[PDB]
UniProtKB/Swiss-Prot annotation, chain A:
Organism from which the protein derives: Saccharomyces cerevisiae (strain ATCC 204508 / S288c) (Baker's yeast)
Gene: PRP8
Domain of life, source organism: Eukaryota
Protein name (database record): Pre-mRNA-splicing factor 8
Lineage of producing organism: Eukaryota, Fungi, Dikarya, Ascomycota, Saccharomycotina
Shown part of the complete sequence: 1256 to 1641 of 2413
Subcellular location: Nucleus
Record's comment describing the protein's domains: The MPN (JAB/Mov34) domain has structural similarity with deubiquitinating enzymes, but lacks the residues that would bind the catalytic metal ion. Contains a region with structural similarity to reverse transcriptase, presenting the classical thumb, fingers and palm architecture, but lacks enzyme activity, since the essential metal-binding residues are not conserved.
Swiss-Prot record, chain B:
Segments forming domain MI: 1-118
Signal peptide: none
Location of this chain's protein in the cell: Cytoplasm; Nucleus
Similarity comment text for this entry: Belongs to the CWC22 family.
Purpose: May be involved in pre-mRNA splicing.
Subunit structure: Belongs to the CWC complex (or CEF1-associated complex), a spliceosome subcomplex composed of the U2, U5 and U6 snRNAs and at least BUD13, BUD31, BRR2, CDC40, CEF1, CLF1, CUS1, CWC2, CWC15, CWC21, CWC22, CWC23, CWC24, CWC25, CWC27, ECM2, HSH155, IST3, ISY1, LEA1, MSL1, NTC20, PRP8, PRP9, PRP11, PRP19, PRP21, PRP22, PRP45, PRP46, SLU7, SMB1, SMD1, SMD2, SMD3, SMX2, SMX3, SNT309, SNU114, SPP2, SYF1, SYF2, RSE1 and YJU2.
Protein name: Pre-mRNA-splicing factor CWC22
Upper taxonomic lineage: Eukaryota, Fungi, Dikarya, Ascomycota, Saccharomycotina
Something else known: Present with 3260 molecules/cell in log phase SD medium.
UniProtKB/Swiss-Prot annotation, chain C:
Keyword Zinc: no
Subunit composition and interactions: Associates with the NTC complex (or PRP19-associated complex), composed of at least CEF1, CLF1, ISY1, NTC20, SNT309, SYF1, SYF2, and PRP19.
Gene that this polypeptide is encoded by: CWC21
Name this polypeptide is given: Pre-mRNA-splicing factor CWC21
InterPro entries membership: CWC21, mRNA_splic_Cwf21_dom
RNA sequence: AGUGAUCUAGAAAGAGAUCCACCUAUCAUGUUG
């Protein structure tokens, strides 16, 4: 009763409705196939991420950890975000039912956080509350995007290998002592099925408005398509792309972008989409808002920082000079390999100082107090950058 | 704070089963269950499109206990009787598909449609647009 | 260590506590019957003959040959009465 | 109709060479007919 194939990294299993024992409702990750003649759903397509793509994601995380031996904490978190967004925006609902990928996501995110922790010579959980990693960059956090704080499905493996057991149990993913639920990236990306159905809708509406616009001998106004602008595949906004008069000649652009892998050592992980031709296919701006809420708001976040000691008037004026510093003046100079590798210590020092009240908190599992020379400060552990 | 708590439970879950499990583990008091359903509906109405995540979540809540089924029943009639006038056509599209999905699988009984009164006086464009999307989902899932 | 087949082999190397929670979300008289009836009717005749045989043997008064003769006589009488009844019912 | 399942935690000495998610871009012309 099942027809199976793997295409473009997706594992697909088609089961016709007429072959099902009973028709049950499904979550995201199970497409409904509609018979265009009857306009009725006649089959379900179950999705999974292929084992090869799972291994490719894990390899990308390994590549980040292997390359970032002397990288700044912020650049490590940014690389993690790039890989995580590439994975989720490409596979979307196929991730939902791929348990080995959830396991790899948990391990990858933990390893990325461990790179920062080990950079600070300490893996002590209480020293690194979620606020350190997930607080947005504009508030001095690493701005990591989470996917692993979810509950991972668990069920008897013996039965799971023979039949679909459903989700009878859950096992913990990433966890922290603090009683707070971090948002998961998946909840901010519209699944492909919904994008395709909404695309069929907005583009049929556009086709109708286009014909009426010519019947009235009008031009369609830019805000005559408001609300649809950020919808469709390609996005409606591409109709008014600034360079559309040249891009009309751009042919074979998808294969060209995929073949870049053979001619360039560093390639975009977004090899599958071109913003000129497709438009912006995702918008993660709401994630930052909700992560700030999940962390307890600005107030709670700043309680973990040195903010009160700065005497700064308001959190609103907290404009980090993200474009200048000593290390930025130095990167162009004649420097030895040692002098260049040593420049990454500077931003790491700033990050450590900002979160220092939490990094040097008193409530630690173990730690002999060492007094800092010429000061009344006690370090609960040896943290050189601090 | 309660709205925030429920919203964060939703946004922290990969699947509707996980979200349903977390909400059920909260042991929400019977008088708050309707407000929880209201938060779930409003959260689903913030998305750009419908999502199976909300239908699975609701379905698991409904089948867990009768108090959740009645909370969903009254939230449906609440939506059609009072809230539809505050919904734009995008929100009505999502809402119609959502309730149509729950009706198409009997999680919400078709008897709930008894509150629908197709007449020029007891209905409004918001309600008729809602009915249109609801029935469109019904025919797509069940067939004529 | 798993419990009822659920958990991880170990929490080590999983990057998680391994804590497991039960999901609250999951929950015309077929000719053969006429043949059996006819057999039962003929059987009742043979049952009567066997009962007579039992009585005569238990009385230990008659030889096996005299008992066989009395049984054949009773069989003939009852079979004739049955054939007459079947002819009358079919009539 | 709501029980259970809870990794982690630091010291010394060496090492380390970089690159791609990411703030929505139509007439207005004086008069001569
Ligand atoms: K050395």
């Amino acid at each position: 009763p099942n027809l199976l194939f793997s295409m473009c990294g997706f594992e697909v299993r088609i089961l016709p409705r007429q072959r099902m024992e009973e028709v049950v409702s499904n979550d995201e990750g199970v497409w409904d196939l509609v018979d265009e003649r009857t306009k009725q759903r006649t089959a379900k397509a179950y999705l999974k991420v292929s084992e090869e793509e799972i291994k490719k994601f894990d390899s990308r995380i390994r590549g980040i950890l292997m390359a970032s031996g002397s990288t700044t904490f912020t650049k490590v978190a940014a690389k993690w975000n790039t890989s995580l967004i590439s994975l989720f925006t490409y596979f979307r609902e196929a991730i939902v039912a791929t348990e080995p990928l959830l396991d790899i996501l948990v391990k990858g995110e933990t390893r990325i956080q461990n790179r920062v922790k080990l950079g600070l010579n300490s893996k002590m959980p209480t020293r690194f509350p979620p606020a350190v990693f997930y607080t947005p960059k504009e508030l001095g956090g690493l701005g990591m995007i989470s996917a692993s704080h979810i509950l991972i499905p668990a069920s008897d493996l013996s039965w799971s290998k023979q039949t679909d057991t459903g989700i009878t149990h859950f096992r913990a993913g990433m966890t922290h002592e603090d009683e707070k639920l971090i948002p998961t990236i998946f909840r901010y990306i519209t699944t492909w099925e919904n994008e395709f159905l909404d695309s069929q809708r907005v583009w049929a509406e556009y086709a109708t408005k286009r014909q009426e616009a010519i019947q009235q001998n009008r031009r369609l106004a830019f805000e005559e398509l408001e609300g649809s602008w950020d919808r469709g595949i390609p996005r409606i906004s591409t109709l008014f792309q600034r360079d559309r008069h040249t891009l009309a000649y751009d042919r074979g652009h998808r294969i060209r972008r995929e073949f870049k892998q053979y001619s360039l050592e560093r390639n975009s992980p977004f090899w599958w989409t071109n913003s000129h031709h497709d438009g912006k296919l995702w918008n993660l701006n709401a994630y930052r808002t909700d992560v700030i809420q999940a962390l307890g708001g600005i107030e709670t976040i700043l309680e973990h920082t040195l903010f009160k000691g700065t005497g700064f008037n308001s959190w609103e004026g907290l404009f980090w000079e993200k474009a200048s510093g000593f290390e930025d003046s130095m990167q162009f100079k004649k420097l030895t390999h040692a002098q260049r590798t040593g420049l990454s210590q500077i931003p790491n020092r700033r990050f450590t100082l900002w979160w220092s009240p939490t990094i040097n908190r008193a409530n630690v599992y173990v730690g002999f107090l060492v007094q800092l020379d010429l000061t009344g400060i006690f370090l609960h552990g040896k943290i050189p950058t601090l | 704070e309660f709205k925030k708590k429920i919203y964060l439970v939703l946004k922290s879950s990969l699947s509707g089963d996980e979200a349903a499990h977390k909400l059920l583990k909260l042991k929400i008091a019977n008088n708050l269950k309707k407000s929880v359903v209201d938060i779930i509906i409003k959260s689903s109405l913030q998305e750009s499109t419908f999502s199976k995540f909300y239908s699975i979540l609701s379905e698991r809540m409904i089948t867990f206990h009768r108090s959740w089924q009645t909370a969903y029943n009254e939230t449906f009639e609440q939506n059609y009787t009072q809230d539809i006038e505050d919904y734009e056509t995008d929100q009505l599209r999502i809402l119609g598909k959502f309730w149509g999905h729950l009706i198409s699988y009997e999680f919400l009984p078709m008897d709930c449609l008894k509150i629908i009164k197709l007449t020029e006086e007891e209905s409004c464009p918001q309600g008729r647009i809602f009915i249109k999307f609801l029935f469109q989902e019904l025919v797509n899932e069940l067939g004529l | 260590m798993s419990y009822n087949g659920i958990g991880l082999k170990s929490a080590k190397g999983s990057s998680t506590s391994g804590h497991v929670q039960r999901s609250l979300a999951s929950n015309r008289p077929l000719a053969v019957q006429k043949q059996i009836e006819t057999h039962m009717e003929k059987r009742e005749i043979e049952v009567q003959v066997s009962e007579l045989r039992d009585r005569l043997e238990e009385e230990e008064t008659l030889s096996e040959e005299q008992i066989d003769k009395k049984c054949e006589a009773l069989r003939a009488k009852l079979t004739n009465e049955w054939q007459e009844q079947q002819r009358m019912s079919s009539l």
